[model samples]
Target: MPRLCRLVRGEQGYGFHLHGEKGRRGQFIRRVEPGSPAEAAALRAGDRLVEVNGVNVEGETHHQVVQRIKAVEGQTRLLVVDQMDSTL
Candidate 1:
């Protein structure tokens, strides 16, 4: 069985521009499954993830970023993600 990974979106117009090997277009994360750990941790859809575990995701392709997210493991992983439309 495959484990479900969670992801949140950033601010509008604040996303990555990446091209895949098959010439597929990449899109930012916009939602996480309900009843999942991500949701339980207060992670929601439409929230931008500016960073991942302290690493800035700026300039990183969606694939690269997603790979990083998938690398997270253990029972309680922490992601240093940022929300959209919020002043940091």
Candidate 2:
């Protein structure tokens, strides 16, 4: 599936949000395209993704994450994401 970033309106406002992680800084995942290989692949909106392709997003600016996501061309290998509210 093709992975992409999008700005979503949160309780605070709008920000960069990715799937498979909790929403942060107004960023939130809106929707994932159907038939996408990423669908039901352990990723979704409201998920605050702190890492991408092994790169840590913590302490990094939103632009940085966006750039990193764009750095990749085709097929995202691994995405390190943190789940917000859940029971282990």
Which stretches of candidate 2 lie above 4 Å from their native place? 1-28, 77-88
**Per-candidate total of colliding backbone pairs:** 3, 6
Error of 2 at 68 (Å): 0.6
- Estimate the TM-score of every prediction: 0.51, 0.51
Computed on alpha carbons, the lDDT of every model, listed in order, comes to 0.45, 0.48
Best prediction by lDDT: 2
Q: How well does candidate 1 match the true structure in TM-score terms?
A: 0.51
> Candidate 2, residues 39-65: lDDT per residue as tens digits?
435456555555566766665665666
Model 1 residue runs over 4 Å out of place are 1-28, 75-88
Candidate 2: RMSD to truth: 9.1
Candidate 2 lDDT at 30 equals 56
Model 2 residue 34 lDDT? 50
